[PDB]
Design a protein around this motif. Structure first.
Motif, mmCIF file in Angstrom:
data_model
loop_
_atom_site.group_PDB
_atom_site.id
_atom_site.type_symbol
_atom_site.label_atom_id
_atom_site.label_comp_id
_atom_site.label_asym_id
_atom_site.label_seq_id
_atom_site.Cartn_x
_atom_site.Cartn_y
_atom_site.Cartn_z
ATOM 1 N N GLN A 24 0.751 -1.215 0.000
ATOM 2 C CA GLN A 24 0.000 0.000 0.000
ATOM 3 C C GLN A 24 0.792 1.279 0.000
ATOM 4 O O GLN A 24 0.429 2.207 -0.681
ATOM 5 C CB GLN A 24 -0.915 0.011 1.188
ATOM 6 N N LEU A 84 4.715 3.054 -3.013
ATOM 7 C CA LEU A 84 4.513 3.937 -4.170
ATOM 8 C C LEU A 84 4.020 5.349 -3.823
ATOM 9 O O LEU A 84 4.541 6.317 -4.361
ATOM 10 C CB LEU A 84 3.597 3.298 -5.215
ATOM 11 N N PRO A 85 3.019 5.468 -2.939
ATOM 12 C CA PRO A 85 2.603 6.804 -2.514
ATOM 13 C C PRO A 85 3.717 7.637 -1.903
ATOM 14 O O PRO A 85 3.792 8.841 -2.157
ATOM 15 C CB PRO A 85 1.539 6.514 -1.474
ATOM 16 N N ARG A 87 10.718 -8.686 -0.600
ATOM 17 C CA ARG A 87 10.158 -9.133 -1.878
ATOM 18 C C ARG A 87 9.390 -7.993 -2.593
ATOM 19 O O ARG A 87 9.657 -7.713 -3.748
ATOM 20 C CB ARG A 87 9.323 -10.405 -1.679
ATOM 21 N N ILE A 88 8.518 -7.291 -1.875
ATOM 22 C CA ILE A 88 7.883 -6.080 -2.388
ATOM 23 C C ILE A 88 8.881 -5.128 -3.007
ATOM 24 O O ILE A 88 8.729 -4.772 -4.165
ATOM 25 C CB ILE A 88 7.061 -5.338 -1.306
ATOM 26 N N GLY A 123 10.572 -6.177 -6.338
ATOM 27 C CA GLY A 123 9.653 -6.123 -7.477
ATOM 28 C C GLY A 123 9.371 -4.709 -7.950
ATOM 29 O O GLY A 123 9.484 -4.413 -9.106
ATOM 30 N N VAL A 124 9.018 -3.836 -7.035
ATOM 31 C CA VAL A 124 8.750 -2.462 -7.379
ATOM 32 C C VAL A 124 9.942 -1.858 -8.115
ATOM 33 O O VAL A 124 9.797 -1.265 -9.172
ATOM 34 C CB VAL A 124 8.400 -1.633 -6.117
ATOM 35 N N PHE A 133 3.415 -17.811 -1.959
ATOM 36 C CA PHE A 133 3.479 -16.480 -1.354
ATOM 37 C C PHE A 133 4.626 -15.610 -1.879
ATOM 38 O O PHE A 133 4.475 -14.405 -2.033
ATOM 39 C CB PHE A 133 3.615 -16.607 0.165
ATOM 40 N N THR A 134 5.781 -16.215 -2.114
ATOM 41 C CA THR A 134 6.934 -15.480 -2.623
ATOM 42 C C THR A 134 6.666 -15.003 -4.049
ATOM 43 O O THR A 134 6.703 -13.799 -4.321
ATOM 44 C CB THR A 134 8.212 -16.343 -2.556
ATOM 45 N N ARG A 137 4.147 -12.244 -4.518
ATOM 46 C CA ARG A 137 4.508 -10.936 -3.969
ATOM 47 C C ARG A 137 5.471 -10.200 -4.889
ATOM 48 O O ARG A 137 5.562 -8.957 -4.849
ATOM 49 C CB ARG A 137 5.097 -11.071 -2.557
ATOM 50 N N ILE A 138 6.173 -10.964 -5.725
ATOM 51 C CA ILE A 138 7.160 -10.386 -6.625
ATOM 52 C C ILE A 138 6.461 -9.881 -7.887
ATOM 53 O O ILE A 138 6.700 -8.762 -8.316
ATOM 54 C CB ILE A 138 8.308 -11.387 -6.919
ATOM 55 N N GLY A 173 4.824 -6.780 -7.142
ATOM 56 C CA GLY A 173 5.761 -5.672 -6.984
ATOM 57 C C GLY A 173 6.231 -5.161 -8.320
ATOM 58 O O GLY A 173 6.268 -3.951 -8.565
ATOM 59 N N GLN A 209 3.346 -3.209 -10.000
ATOM 60 C CA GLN A 209 3.154 -1.907 -9.389
ATOM 61 C C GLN A 209 4.212 -0.951 -9.927
ATOM 62 O O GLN A 209 3.969 0.233 -10.159
ATOM 63 C CB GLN A 209 3.331 -2.019 -7.877
ATOM 64 N N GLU A 253 -1.060 1.913 -7.220
ATOM 65 C CA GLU A 253 -1.081 1.945 -5.764
ATOM 66 C C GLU A 253 -1.885 0.784 -5.167
ATOM 67 O O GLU A 253 -1.515 0.237 -4.118
ATOM 68 C CB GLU A 253 -1.704 3.268 -5.296
ATOM 69 N N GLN A 254 -2.987 0.426 -5.831
ATOM 70 C CA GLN A 254 -3.962 -0.516 -5.274
ATOM 71 C C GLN A 254 -3.826 -1.979 -5.705
ATOM 72 O O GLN A 254 -4.668 -2.804 -5.333
ATOM 73 C CB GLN A 254 -5.381 -0.062 -5.594
ATOM 74 N N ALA A 255 -2.808 -2.317 -6.488
ATOM 75 C CA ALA A 255 -2.524 -3.725 -6.792
ATOM 76 C C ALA A 255 -2.111 -4.485 -5.528
ATOM 77 O O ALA A 255 -1.080 -4.168 -4.915
ATOM 78 C CB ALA A 255 -1.405 -3.829 -7.806
ATOM 79 N N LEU A 256 -2.885 -5.506 -5.151
ATOM 80 C CA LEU A 256 -2.685 -6.149 -3.849
ATOM 81 C C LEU A 256 -3.097 -7.621 -3.841
ATOM 82 O O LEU A 256 -4.007 -8.022 -4.579
ATOM 83 C CB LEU A 256 -3.446 -5.368 -2.770
ATOM 84 N N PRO A 257 -2.427 -8.441 -3.004
ATOM 85 C CA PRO A 257 -2.816 -9.838 -3.056
ATOM 86 C C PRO A 257 -4.063 -10.169 -2.226
ATOM 87 O O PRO A 257 -4.519 -9.368 -1.395
ATOM 88 C CB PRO A 257 -1.589 -10.568 -2.475
#
Ligand code: NA
Ligand code: NA
Ligand code: NA
Ligand code: NA
Lengths: 213, 208, 212, 208, 215, 205
Positions: E37, E40-41, E73-74, E77-78, F67-68, F71-72, F75, F78, F200-204
């Motif tokens: 969440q 990015l903001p 991990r987040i 990717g970002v 899960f891994t 999440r990638i 990411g 996004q 912003e709102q891409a989410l699992p």
């Protein structure tokens, strides 16, 4: 006249709405169970956009269920907190009713059998019939296996509304028309809350509670 | 006489009391094992001693299978420890008396929603001051439902009237949202108590 | 002057507590919290004769514990805090156990364990530092077999919480333990005191549960 | 102290009492709103005054949804009119204590049959004189069930053990037919009363 | 002259930083939000606050852990996504180093033993010593039980500081410093400082290339 | 509409593109997603002679699954969307399975399942105008508790725990994983209905 706030998080949909000076405003998003994460920000944004102070709110409407166990209860908590702090009344309204009233707004149905998917292979079920603008309950609400489901009408045109209708093939009756994607929407809660507020049905925050079926 | 009246047979939770004055507390929320006792205490104090109570009246059903049974168990307990008798009253009758007090209906076909796509059905006619059962109470599909009067002007009271469209006859006016109310149970208890209808706490039981 | 309201419903315990003018009051009941928490909050402010407007921050148990119970507290706290425009203070329920165990039994090293779903425990180790039980390492959700303390093999430590019903499957055990302790809002409040003093408060919207 | 113990959480209906003497009445028949009160009266007289009772203990569940609630309502009523406190005790714990008294089991995995193809599950270990919960009680499918000890020697008590074949572990010995018994509730109430655990009649409620 | 964006989400803290025309700017926020969440903001806000366009970024640094391997991990990717689209290099930096750089900035410490709590009774371990304004690893990072950790300087004579959540295990360690801070977390500002040193050495990897991050 | 679609939800790694009404896809099973996804995106882009700036929206598998890997991909997506300033389309991995099993095995209705500790991810889908739409609700459940909303197929890693379902199907593929081309299909439906959202709102799940 009356300023009303409406919150619903009973299903995958998180929505909020505001009645202020005869105008109605709404925000609606579908997420899965990040509700605790997004319900307050939504209230904040809505009030901000409308230019309405929270203190201006006369009553808070909420979806009381049935639906997700944790979902429903998140709405309950937030509403409890808000109404107790403000010292304002709350209005409990069924999510099946909200479904019914939405199907009436979007598809013009006056006779709706609202059904919501439920745990353990049952569905929640309540049938509603338009009366003077308001979808009103006909009989009782229940949690039933989709096989044991039944309408209170005879020859009558009716509508199937909600994700319970994913089980339509397992169900006795099929309606002429149906929508199984449909979720409770706070805009429609706001309509129902209006009728309840007119009859003065509001209660203290401590009694903002979920239903058991 | 001083009488106490409880009813948890529906969504409605309600308690009422009769020295000579009559008071009522009524809250609609589905839980009954939580709010019943408090409502009792709130009423006894905002009016009176519990050991002063001469008899206790209750909804015997029909209604919610568990709901009626919570009220019974409470009444069974209260009355035993107090050593006072109890007053079994039908919930369909209470509806009848309510529709009388509220809308002046002298002929009331009471219908409460039941399991398994059926309704609890009972017809009541005003005799003297009281609504009185005409024939017998039953559990029927809505299409088999029938009244014991000619169609005269009669009233439909209770949640069973959601199924009105499926019934073979409809009254001039009806209220599909009426629920048994403890005030009305108390009225009905007056007639029953004055006729010496009370029984020992054990015999307090739900209807089948 | 700082006034702090504290709510906890993470486990079968439901407790509230208040800190006003250097005084600490608290109620505690073990029993559906959605029915009980707010009435308790009312009765408490009444008993102390304080008004909700006075409150400067609201502290809460952020879990770990019962999935829905934690969320009920978070929801009420969010709601109180937003309407009141006050900040919130997130405190771990493992920390609260540790703080309780210190208050109630003088333990300065506490391995807090709360029974979790699916044959695991929530696990966190804490040690006294300037009167506050502070986390040593990380909180985790673990099978009891994989549980470990950060201290040398017995100074002594103490086992606190319902996770200790699994003591026999754990690789070690303390000399003393209480497998029946639950979070108590009086200890939440002591901890809140410390976090308020370091300006740890956040916006109402950010009052959320932890995931381990 | 004089204590009264009721349990209607299962097929079993049972009542027990503790001056210093201890007596028990136990009947298996599925109805509970009929036979409970009589069993109370039979016991008080064949031993003692009701207003002499200092506290009342009850099975809070888990078990039969309606069954537990009938006992609660009775206890709620009895205690309110008497103005005495109540002693909430788990039915899984009573099973634990029963399997102790009967077969000398110091580690008891209690399992009561539940709706929807699940079991109520609770593990108890003998501490001092009393079986005490190890971890928490749950409602689980039989395949997800687990014990908090190493496998040591432990016992399986209760109807949930009909599903033993579907469980991931089985004890050395087990009794699939054990049911909560009021005698054992009374033992458990002793520990609870001595620890001052009593609460006001209203707070008497079933577990979820 | 060089414009670098830096982010870290390896712990409870989310932070973002920017070097632009010699000036550093950073936002640090400690919250329970899932980073997905808020990362990015925060990037959006910082760029707008600095008046810098995303396209002016020459390279992007991130903490590659160790830490909570959900937030790491987040981040991976970002940054890979931002860089693939901009066609700019990526700079993986150790969170153990970030800690060291932070203890140096905040506390003046020129020798830092960074330790971060790890899964299953281990800690991540890395020792760092100042060189020309940059904290520099000596000689490798490991994931170890606390009883086996070691410092490359003289444990008693030298002056060193312990930083990070791993110092929760200090009693089980074979040595300990005079001062430590077991609550210290990575901060993007110190990630920025380190990114600059790495960038100046010609480090930087295209998003397509295999990333020197082993999870 | 040019649409880019990515999946690393499971062990399989896949990307797809819809440009000029043509649909192209690359699929590769590799147990290493933070390493092979972007190369795949670049290769596929070269092969289509499309520039990333052309893309109007980016679809992704939102889970459930590993899960891994999830999440990638989230990411990456996004990051791509933030930088290109493009909307994103979240699509369930269970829907993707159901759409694959339709395209491949002709299945007009599918019961998708993906292994999670003990429990398995469950969702049942039905065909409605070429789109496998969700019937009830997606759920995480133990294999025994699993129900159906109804000549029906069983798809996914979670159908390896077949015994005591209780219901067994007509035919089934227990090694079926999500595929970007079928994510692409579903995305076109979502796109056409205006279902896009902010990066912003891409989410699992
Ligand atoms: Na269902
Ligand atoms: Na557990
Ligand atoms: Na961080
Ligand atoms: Na560790």
């Amino acid at each position: 006249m009356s300023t009303l706030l409406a919150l619903d998080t009973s299903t995958e949909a998180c929505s909020v709405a505001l009645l202020h000076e005869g105008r109605a405003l709404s925000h609606y998003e579908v997420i899965p169970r990040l509700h605790a994460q997004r319900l307050l920000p939504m209230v904040r944004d809505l009030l901000d956009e409308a230019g309405v102070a929270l203190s201006a709110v006369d009553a808070i409407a909420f979806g009381r269920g049935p639906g997700a166990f944790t979902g429903v209860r998140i709405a309950i908590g937030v509403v409890q907190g808000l109404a107790f702090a403000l010292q304002r009344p709350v209005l409990a309204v069924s999510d099946l009713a909200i479904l019914a009233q939405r199907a009436y707004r979007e598809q013009g149905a006056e006779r709706v059998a609202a059904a919501i998917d439920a745990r353990m292979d049952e569905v929640y079920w309540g049938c509603y019939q338009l009366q003077q603008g308001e979808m009103r309950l006909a009989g009782s609400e229940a949690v039933l296996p989709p096989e044991r489901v039944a309408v209170p009408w005879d020859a009558a045109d009716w509508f199937g509304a909600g994700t319970g209708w994913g089980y339509v093939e397992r169900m006795p009756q099929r309606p002429v028309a149906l929508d199984a994607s449909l979720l409770p929407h706070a805009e429609d809660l706001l309509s129902l809350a209006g009728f309840a507020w007119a009859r003065g049905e509001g209660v203290e925050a401590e009694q903002a509670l979920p239903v058991y079926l």
